[PDB]
Structures are given as C-alpha cells and as structure tokens.
A paper describes a structure:
[name] ([name], [name]-1 or SR-F1) is a type I transmembrane protein that recognizes multiple endogenous and exogenous ligands such as modified low-density lipoproteins (LDLs) and is important for maintaining homeostasis and immunity. [name] (MW, 86 kD) is a type I transmembrane protein that has a short signal peptide followed by a long extracellular region, a transmembrane helix, and a large cytoplasmic portion. Its ectodomain has three glycosylation sites and contains multiple EGF-like domains, which usually has a two-stranded β-sheet followed by a loop region and three conserved disulfide bonds. Here, we solve the crystal structures of the N-terminal fragments of human [name], which show that [name] forms homodimers and its epidermal growth factor (EGF)-like domains adopt a long-curved conformation.
Among them, two fragments (f1, 20–132aa and f2, 20–221aa) were crystallized and the crystals diffracted to 2.2 Å and 2.6 Å, respectively. The structure of f2 fragment was solved by molecular replacement using the structure of f1 fragment combined with the EGF-like fragments predicted by AlphaFold as phasing models and refined to 2.6 Å resolution. The crystal belongs to space group P4122 with one molecule per asymmetric unit. In the f2 crystal structure, the N-terminal region of [name] (residue 20–56aa) and the C-terminal region (210–221aa) are largely missing, suggesting these regions are quite flexible, consistent with low electron density of the N-terminal end of the f1 crystal. Rest of the f2 fragment adopts a long-curved conformation with multiple EGF-like domains arranged in tandem. Interestingly, in the crystal of f2 fragment, although an asymmetric unit has only one molecule, the dimer related by the crystallographic twofold symmetry can be well superimposed with the dimer found in the asymmetric unit of f1 crystals, suggesting that dimerization occurs in a similar fashion for the two fragments in different crystal forms. At the dimeric interfaces of f1 and f2 fragments, hydrogen bonds are formed between S88 and Y94 of the monomers, and F82 and Y94 are also close to each other, thus may form π-π interaction. But the salt bridges are not found in f2 crystals, suggesting they are not required for dimerization. To identify the binding site for modified LDLs on the region identified above (133–221aa), we calculated the surface electrostatic potential of the region based on the crystal structure of f2 fragment and found a positively charged area in this region, which is mainly composed of two sites, one is R160 and R161 (Site 1), the other is R188 and R189 (Site 2). The triple or quadruple mutants, R160S/R161S/R188S, R160S/R188S/R189S, and R160S/R161S/R188S/R189S, where positive charges are largely removed for the two sites, almost lost binding activities with modified LDLs completely, suggesting these arginines are crucial for lipoprotein interaction and both sites contribute to the recognition.
Numbering used by the authors: 57 to 209
Write the structure that this text describes.
Amino acid sequence: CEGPDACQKDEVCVKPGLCRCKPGFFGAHCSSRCPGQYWGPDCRESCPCHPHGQCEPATGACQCQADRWGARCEFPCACGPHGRCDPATGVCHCEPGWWSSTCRRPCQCNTAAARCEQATGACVCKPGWWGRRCSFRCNCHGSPCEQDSGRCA
C-alpha cells in the first residue's frame, strides 16, 4: 500500500492500492469531522442512532446521549438523579440506597444493608447481617446467615 499508492498521514489504507480519509473524517485534506449520521473512513457508513447520539468513528458502536436509550437512541430515560440510565433498555440502575423503577425512593434500612430491591425496597444485607432491615449480626463466627432467621451458612 506504498510507493505511488502510498498513503500520506490523516488517511488509512482501505484497500491494498487505495486510501481513504481516516475514520470519522472527510474532505479535501481529510480535515472535517463526519456528521453524526455517518462513521467509518470517509463517512462511508451509516450511524443508526443519530440524532440524540453518535457512533464511535472507527468501530461504529452506538453512543447515546446520557438521558437517551434505544436502538436509535430515540427514547428518553425516566431515571431520577440517583439512577443511571441503560442505553440499551431504558432500565434505571439504582445507586445503593435507592429503589423504584426510577431510583427515586430511598431505602428504609439500617447501615448494614448493601442496597435494596428495586421493586419493593426490601433490604439486602451485607454478608454477616440479618433481619428485616439488616439490623442483626449473625451468630455464625463470621459466616453469613439467613435474613429472616439468622440460621447460619
């Protein structure tokens, strides 16, 4: 891909005797960034998820805006501040201490809870604690135990 078919900087060898602008770029001096609807060398391939998103210039990986999700980043997210949106499904992932599908309700647990269950606010205990709100320590020489009974593991 060299010699008279050589490939000066800011381009890439697409085919062994050819060159095109490096991915994400185009123009007389391979200097302009592709518009969001394109990606790849010389804007030769389509970005499905524009607008409200762009594709990675080289690989084509969809990249939604933060509040967006879907196969085209077409849908907006419902997540509250304490919920990180999932660009594939719209699911809100709650930071520990939050629940509801929007991650807008705070857990009603003691400090030994690792988090709580998104649908119900049910406390999930750090290993070594039990109780409705993970109030109790296990009587199990450090092993974890069953949440309702304290029966060892």
